[PDB]
Amino acid sequence: IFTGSADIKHLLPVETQRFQSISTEFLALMKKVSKSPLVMDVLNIQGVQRSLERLADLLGKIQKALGEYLERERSSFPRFYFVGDEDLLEIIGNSKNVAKLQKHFKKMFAGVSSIILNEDNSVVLGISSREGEEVMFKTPVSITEHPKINEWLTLVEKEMRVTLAKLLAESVTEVEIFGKATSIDPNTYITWIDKYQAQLVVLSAQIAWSENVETALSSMGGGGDAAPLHSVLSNVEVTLNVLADSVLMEQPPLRRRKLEHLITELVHQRDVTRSLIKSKIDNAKSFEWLSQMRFYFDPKQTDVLQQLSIQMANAKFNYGFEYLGVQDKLVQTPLTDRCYLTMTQALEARLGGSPFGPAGTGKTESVKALGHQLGRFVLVFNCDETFDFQAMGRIFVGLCQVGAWGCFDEFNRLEERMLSAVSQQVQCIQEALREHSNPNYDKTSAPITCELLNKQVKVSPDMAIFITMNNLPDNLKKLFRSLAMTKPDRQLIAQVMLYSQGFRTAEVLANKIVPFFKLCDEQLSSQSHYDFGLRALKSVLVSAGNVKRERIQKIKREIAENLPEQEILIQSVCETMVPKLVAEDIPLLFSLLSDVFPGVQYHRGEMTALREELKKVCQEMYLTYGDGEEVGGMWVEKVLQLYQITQINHGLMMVGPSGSGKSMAWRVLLKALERLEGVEGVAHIIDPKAISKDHLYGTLDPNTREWTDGLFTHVLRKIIDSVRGELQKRQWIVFDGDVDPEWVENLNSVLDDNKLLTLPNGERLSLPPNVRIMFEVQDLKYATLATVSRCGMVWFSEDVLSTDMIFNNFLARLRSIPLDSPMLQIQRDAATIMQPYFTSNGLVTKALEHAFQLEHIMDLTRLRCLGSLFSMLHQACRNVAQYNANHPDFPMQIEQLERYIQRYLVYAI
Amino acid sequence: IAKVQADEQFGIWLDSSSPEQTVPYLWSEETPATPIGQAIHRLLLIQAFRPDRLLAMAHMFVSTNLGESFMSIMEQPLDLTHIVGTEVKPNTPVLMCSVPGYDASGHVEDLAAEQNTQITSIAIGSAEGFNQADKAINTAVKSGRWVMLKNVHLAPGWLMQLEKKLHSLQPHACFRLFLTMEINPKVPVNLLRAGRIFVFEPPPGVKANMLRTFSSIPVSRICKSPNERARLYFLLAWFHAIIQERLRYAPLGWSKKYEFGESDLRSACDTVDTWLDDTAKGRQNISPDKIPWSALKTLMAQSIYGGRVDNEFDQRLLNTFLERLFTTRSFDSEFKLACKVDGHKDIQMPDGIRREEFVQWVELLPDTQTPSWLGLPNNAERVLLTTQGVDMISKMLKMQAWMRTLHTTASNWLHLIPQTLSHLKRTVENIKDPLFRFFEREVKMGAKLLQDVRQDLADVVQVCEGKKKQTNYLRTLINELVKGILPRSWSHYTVPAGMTVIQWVSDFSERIKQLQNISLAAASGGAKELKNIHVCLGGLFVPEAYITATRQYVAQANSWSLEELCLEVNVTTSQGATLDACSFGVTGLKLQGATCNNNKLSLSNAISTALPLTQLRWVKQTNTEKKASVVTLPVYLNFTRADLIFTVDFEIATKEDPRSFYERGVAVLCT
Numbered sequence A: 001i002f003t004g005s006a007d008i009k010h011l012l013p014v015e016t017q018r019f020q021s022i023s024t025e026f027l028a029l030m031k032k033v034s035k036s037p038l039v040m041d042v043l044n045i046q047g048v049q050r051s052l053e054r055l056a057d058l059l060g061k062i063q064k065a066l067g068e069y070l071e072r073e074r075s076s077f078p079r080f081y082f083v084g085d086e087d088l089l090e091i092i093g094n095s096k097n098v099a100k101l102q103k104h105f106k107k108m109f110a111g112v113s114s115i116i117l118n119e120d121n122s123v124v125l126g127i128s129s130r131e132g133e134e135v136m137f138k139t140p141v142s143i144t145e146h147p148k149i150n151e152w153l154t155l156v157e158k159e160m161r162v163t164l165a166k167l168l169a170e171s172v173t174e175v176e177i178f179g180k181a182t183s184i185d186p187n188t189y190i191t192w193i194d195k196y197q198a199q200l201v202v203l204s205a206q207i208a209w210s211e212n213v214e215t216a217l218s219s220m221g222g223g224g225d226a227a228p229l230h231s232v233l234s235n236v237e238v239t240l241n242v243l244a245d246s247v248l249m250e251q252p253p254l255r256r257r258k259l260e261h262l263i264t265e266l267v268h269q270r271d272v273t274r275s276l277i278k279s280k281i282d283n284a285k286s287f288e289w290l291s292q293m294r295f296y297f298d299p300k301q302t303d304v305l306q307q308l309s310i311q312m313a314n315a316k317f318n319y320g321f322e323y324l325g326v327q328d329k330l331v332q333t334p335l336t337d338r339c340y341l342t343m344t345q346a347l348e349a350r351l352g353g354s355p356f357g358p359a360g361t362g363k364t365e366s367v368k369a370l371g372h373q374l375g376r377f378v379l380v381f382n383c384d385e386t387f388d389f390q391a392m393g394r395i396f397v398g399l400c401q402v403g404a405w406g407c408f409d410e411f412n413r414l415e416e417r418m419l420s421a422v423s424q425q426v427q428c429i430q431e432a433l434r435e436h437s438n439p440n441y442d443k444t445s446a447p448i449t450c451e452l453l454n455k456q457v458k459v460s461p462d463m464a465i466f467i468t469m470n471n472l473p474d475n476l477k478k479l480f481r482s483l484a485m486t487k488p489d490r491q492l493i494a495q496v497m498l499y500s501q502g503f504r505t506a507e508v509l510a511n512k513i514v515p516f517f518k519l520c521d522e523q524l525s526s527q528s529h530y531d532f533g534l535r536a537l538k539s540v541l542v543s544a545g546n547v548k549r550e551r552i553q554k555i556k557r558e559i560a561e562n563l564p565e566q567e568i569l570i571q572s573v574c575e576t577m578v579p580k581l582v583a584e585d586i587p588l589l590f591s592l593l594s595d596v597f598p599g600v601q602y603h604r605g606e607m608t609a610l611r612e613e614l615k616k617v618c619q620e621m622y623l624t625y626g627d628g629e630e631v632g633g634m635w636v637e638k639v640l641q642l643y644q645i646t647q648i649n650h651g652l653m654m655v656g657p658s659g660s661g662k663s664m665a666w667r668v669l670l671k672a673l674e675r676l677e678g679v680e681g682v683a684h685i686i687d688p689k690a691i692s693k694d695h696l697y698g699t700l701d702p703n704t705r706e707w708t709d710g711l712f713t714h715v716l717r718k719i720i721d722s723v724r725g726e727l728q729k730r731q732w733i734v735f736d737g738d739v740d741p742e743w744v745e746n747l748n749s750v751l752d753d754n755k756l757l758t759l760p761n762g763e764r765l766s767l768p769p770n771v772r773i774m775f776e777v778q779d780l781k782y783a784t785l786a787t788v789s790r791c792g793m794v795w796f797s798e799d800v801l802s803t804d805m806i807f808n809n810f811l812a813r814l815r816s817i818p819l820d821s822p823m824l825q826i827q828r829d830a831a832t833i834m835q836p837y838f839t840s841n842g843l844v845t846k847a848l849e850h851a852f853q854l855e856h857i858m859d860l861t862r863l864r865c866l867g868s869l870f871s872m873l874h875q876a877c878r879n880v881a882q883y884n885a886n887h888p889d890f891p892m893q894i895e896q897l898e899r900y901i902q903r904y905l906v907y908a909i
Numbered sequence B: 001i002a003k004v005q006a007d008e009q010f011g012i013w014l015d016s017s018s019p020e021q022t023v024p025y026l027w028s029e030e031t032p033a034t035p036i037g038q039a040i041h042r043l044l045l046i047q048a049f050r051p052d053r054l055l056a057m058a059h060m061f062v063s064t065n066l067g068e069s070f071m072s073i074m075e076q077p078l079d080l081t082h083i084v085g086t087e088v089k090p091n092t093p094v095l096m097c098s099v100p101g102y103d104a105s106g107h108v109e110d111l112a113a114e115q116n117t118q119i120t121s122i123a124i125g126s127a128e129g130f131n132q133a134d135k136a137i138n139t140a141v142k143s144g145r146w147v148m149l150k151n152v153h154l155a156p157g158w159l160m161q162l163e164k165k166l167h168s169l170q171p172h173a174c175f176r177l178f179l180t181m182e183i184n185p186k187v188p189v190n191l192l193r194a195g196r197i198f199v200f201e202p203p204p205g206v207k208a209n210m211l212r213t214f215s216s217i218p219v220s221r222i223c224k225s226p227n228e229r230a231r232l233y234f235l236l237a238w239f240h241a242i243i244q245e246r247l248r249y250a251p252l253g254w255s256k257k258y259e260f261g262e263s264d265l266r267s268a269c270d271t272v273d274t275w276l277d278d279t280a281k282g283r284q285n286i287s288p289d290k291i292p293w294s295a296l297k298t299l300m301a302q303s304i305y306g307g308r309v310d311n312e313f314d315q316r317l318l319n320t321f322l323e324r325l326f327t328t329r330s331f332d333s334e335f336k337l338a339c340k341v342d343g344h345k346d347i348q349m350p351d352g353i354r355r356e357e358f359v360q361w362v363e364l365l366p367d368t369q370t371p372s373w374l375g376l377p378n379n380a381e382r383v384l385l386t387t388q389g390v391d392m393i394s395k396m397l398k399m400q401a402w403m404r405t406l407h408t409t410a411s412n413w414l415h416l417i418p419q420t421l422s423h424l425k426r427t428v429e430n431i432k433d434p435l436f437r438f439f440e441r442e443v444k445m446g447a448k449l450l451q452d453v454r455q456d457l458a459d460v461v462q463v464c465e466g467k468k469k470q471t472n473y474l475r476t477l478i479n480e481l482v483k484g485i486l487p488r489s490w491s492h493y494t495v496p497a498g499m500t501v502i503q504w505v506s507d508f509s510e511r512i513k514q515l516q517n518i519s520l521a522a523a524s525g526g527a528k529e530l531k532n533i534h535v536c537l538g539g540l541f542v543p544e545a546y547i548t549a550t551r552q553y554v555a556q557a558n559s560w561s562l563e564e565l566c567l568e569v570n571v572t573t574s575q576g577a578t579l580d581a582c583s584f585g586v587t588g589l590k591l592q593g594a595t596c597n598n599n600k601l602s603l604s605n606a607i608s609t610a611l612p613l614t615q616l617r618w619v620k621q622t623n624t625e626k627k628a629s630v631v632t633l634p635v636y637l638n639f640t641r642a643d644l645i646f647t648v649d650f651e652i653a654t655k656e657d658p659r660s661f662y663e664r665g666v667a668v669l670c671t
């Protein structure tokens, strides 16, 4: 703690002095012990026990002092409760160098992942999100004027909120001009979209629509006479047309995300105004309008948190103005509307939200979307054994202090005692929230507090606890309002997403693609790696949008609305699903595609550039290559699919029964990439089960606190350091062997978008863009869904590698590789003699097919018996060579050799 | 047979209100029997004829065997003052277990009030409550007073510690310890064994439920603000009572067992209060049409009473009830809370303005509450009584050398279960038929399960004579067989909860016979004959897959897309009526609560009106709005409405209305 940093001396000076004295005495004692390491000699030194106990109690007292300092640092800046004790020690110690601070900002704030400082790192100019979006403070804060970490971080947070408020005011000022007009100019609209953040743009659109609808309803007091609601709907349609025209062109990814968020929100507003408000509704106080989430902007208010008010039914909320960056916006389906209504009603009554339902219906996502709608920091606590008391208690304290939201992914996944303790803590917090709204004590004078960490903790009124289920504990039955989220509306989520992607026939495409995925989940066989859920559907939809845009770009460099959108959709579906399908399910998939998409066919990518280097590499490695229906067509298709998912993402996983062309596929792919792209390929084949987890990743010395890297970590560190220049070279870490939830725990943070290996010692390794982590496994039977979902996959069924391919490889190696020139001649003669028997319907194939029917003491595998047969034929050739050596005159003749090989083949079979 | 055929009052006896009172002398005995033997024979007859009166006949048998008024003491109120005075030692705690949603502290507090002995009532929710209760019990056992511990089911470990602590000698004899708690399995067994358990249940009835609701709500809340608040609260209480009494009829009336507890009632009351305050700023009475009816209906259909509703049909039923009750017509003198009640009688809305009149009207409700009050058919009570009698029989069986009987049962099962059906499938030609692939999967699954079951039964048989060794899997299987629970390794398809092994093997034999017929039809002509098969959805392991295969086949013929096909259902009289290019015959469908004539539904008192032959037609969707004279009836798999296969659109007769179909739980069943 006290020597890895330099700023620790200023924060805790007197404790630093006491520790220096303790360390001096300890070093003197250690030097005395070193001169006589004998146990009896050490024990016989004058007063070892007395000085040792003095050091022990002094170290204890300074440890409680440091803990108290950490607690006061947490109390001064409440967001410090989210980071750990070691993380806080690093933060306070490394306050001078902000580089070590930026690795924590994604844990305290919501969207903030870094801070933009000055040239000398003196003033915090602004904040930056994870996606690169930057918010510049209107009045930048200075670290030199407020050197203490907590005070300048609090100034940063307050200035963030103020800057968001001012930007919202300006964006609303612009969007009121945009809204009260027709035939919006695309240029000015796009400039406005680029000017403001995605959160701000969406919020401004919502505010403008809400005020417009409120004004229209107020002017319609008499009735339907002189109805401007039609004008509001026409304005929304015009804006949607402008956005749909804009998304069809080439846009930056950030502006693309802003455009699709705007399209989603404008589609929701169009649906609301077209039907839910135009059904003979003329009063602003009617519940048909009060039920909808209305936004009211009052820029005249001085306080930033009081400027914007979000109201749904009788519940009124103040926007928290927390920076969120660019978050994924859910399509507001009627189920999402019901979720918002129920959760807001629960929050108004100071209860909790328990949206129970089957996994994958968006309960946690809906809770997060509602929290982001009100601008509140939302924390999700996964209960899939990545759970702990020591973090959760202080996280609850932080939620109470700062006023953020806390959602549990699946509370029933918690173990019984852990579940009971967390239920007790949640009950305490929720009882505090309930007393916060006492009818007799509505004017809260004394602060409402709860008993967390055996101490009083102030509870912010804006916080909330959401417990997603799949029943609730008896403690929380009377405190949480349940909500059944069982069947998500996929035929609308797909439609809105396809419309945002630029598709002009989104409704038909959704009505075709949702039942098709239902059929795939039903008609196709049951496999562990199959995923036809809502996330897979959304991924396929974004891939289809990317494919359509790529086709538009290709056609332009050679309006353009005549594309076969169904063909693009099925091409995306195939490119995403076929690689992970067993050979039995491919005809079923194509039959389902024909059933749902009639007469629309899928043509693969030719890839003739790489499909010639593949042929050359296969020729020079004695393999068999063929295109499509020819022999080896399925294998080269699997190789090309492996190349496709290699391009798409890192963290591959080639699965298939033992005996398929798995290792050869990626070896040939690596060699073909090396010969084609000119980039040398190096592959590190690692068996994870051969060595222990400590040897695989490294171990931290219990006493010395010295870290020695493991095999995988050593490989990654070597690839990163670039002492030899392994960059500009394709590095492939192939994890040949079996996969279990034990050794892949540290790899989960690498396989996902983090690409980040966190070591126990603290050192963090970043995955370079030229490294792919391949999993060459066999069954995928003991792998958690977390690892499978994070990895692109190609399935190598046994039908991929036919027996004729094995025979051709064996004969080619016999004719080329010497079993050590006369030996080569003997091998070629033997191969010529035995070639007729190694045919499609020859003696060997029929004998093998029959032999599968017999009973064997061990499970008969095709390659085991084939390899034994090849070895014994090699020994037959060796015997022929030995006989020729024994008879220098009159060697083996062609008739005698023919008879000997013909009989030896039967003997070996 | 001859006895029932010759008798002519037997028919009118079958339809009597209480057949158990006058059971005809039907058994043939050479010598006169004792009254107990007569009771046994009449009980057997009641089990055969009109099993719903089995509970009443069991009561009569208990009266004839153990003496009349044996159960009369139970009907009297629990005078537990004598039980806390004597028959309970101070060492033994008095456990007051209540059904979830009920409170037992009232009785004990009242007996303390009349016995002028104070109780240190303590809630065990908080952690400080542990120390408070410890101090209270110490002081009360030193002095000799009484102590209470409310909601102790929340602290199981602390309950075990309390049980350990109480085991020591307790110096005072006037000490009594009461543990008010909820009936939960988390309570320790030792505490239950060491104390006197008292089970408290809420009395059944709409009147009792509404009285409890009105007593719970303070008078100040109801008598406040516009006078319409009292009527709104009365409507809310009636709605809560209706939806809570419909829960007792779990399959028919609410599908599942939702909570619908006091929390939902309090939330609804808060919503009513807030919205009536918002709409009515002043204390003056507001017009009934100015009540925010839409707000109340939406918030009590989507947030309160609706959050825990998952399937769409219970939500539809809840919306029907809310739109019927919460409307501006409720404030008129002609409003009818429930119609058709007891045939012609109606529950007229009371004409009151204050809480007192509504409470008096509640107290004047007649005791003769039929299920027609709730909107359910009156036969729901009969069905519930039959189910309760079946449960009683099951309990008596559960509370009742095995090698011989297991051997004979397994041999009889082997004779019953068909031997073996072979996979006659996987033809390269005509694989394009979705029906062929679906029946391939069904035949493969059925054959695999049949082989597994037959091998396991043969193993059990061989071990019955001890001709072979016994393994762990076999031990578990034979234990579940002797105990009567179906093996978990045998359940590869959807099975109704609590299905006996005999019923399971009979159903499996029927399914295997159907699959054999399917295989024979496929072998005889090919996949063309697969189309013209009157398959029964109940026999099929996954009927939804059959519906999907039907849709795919009808699309592939004529080359349509699956999105454009909608299901049209036509019920034909002939069990073998000719099918067109799109109709697939489906047999075994049973309609509950209604009868279909010429594809037109009509409400009926009789349940389970079997459908002769159901023709499932997939026609191209014409994109039209369905008329107001059709109903979307669910098609569940079995009598336990837990799995939804698909929905059917039937046209109703012009006399009835769809709301009555919705609230009577009319649905189609595969089995």
Ligand SMILES: Nc1ncnc2c1ncn2[C@@H]1O[C@H](COP(=O)(O)OP(=O)(O)OP(=O)(O)O)[C@@H](O)[C@H]1O
Binding pocket: A618, A622, A623, A624, A625, A632, A635, A657, A658, A659, A660, A661, A662, A663, A664, A665, A778, A801, A805, A806, A808, A809
């Ligand atoms: N065109 C070909 N592509 C790949 N392998 C081929 C080809 N022709 C013949 N073979 C032979 O097929 C075998 C392929 O084995 P491979 O190393 O790909 O299997 P694997 O899945 O990694 O093995 P396992 O999982 O069983 O340990 C080799 O014996 C190889 O010689």
Ligand SMILES: Nc1ncnc2c1ncn2[C@@H]1O[C@H](COP(=O)(O)OP(=O)(O)O)[C@@H](O)[C@H]1O
Binding pocket: A329, A330, A331, A332, A333, A336, A358, A359, A360, A361, A362, A363, A364, A365, A366, A409, A468, A488, A493, A534, A535, A538
């Ligand atoms: N209304 C919706 N709009 C858009 N996407 C949704 C919606 N509901 C769910 N999803 C998607 O479903 C996926 C999984 O939902 P998730 O919240 O993980 O389910 P669960 O609540 O069971 O964990 C998410 O990636 C989310 O994008």
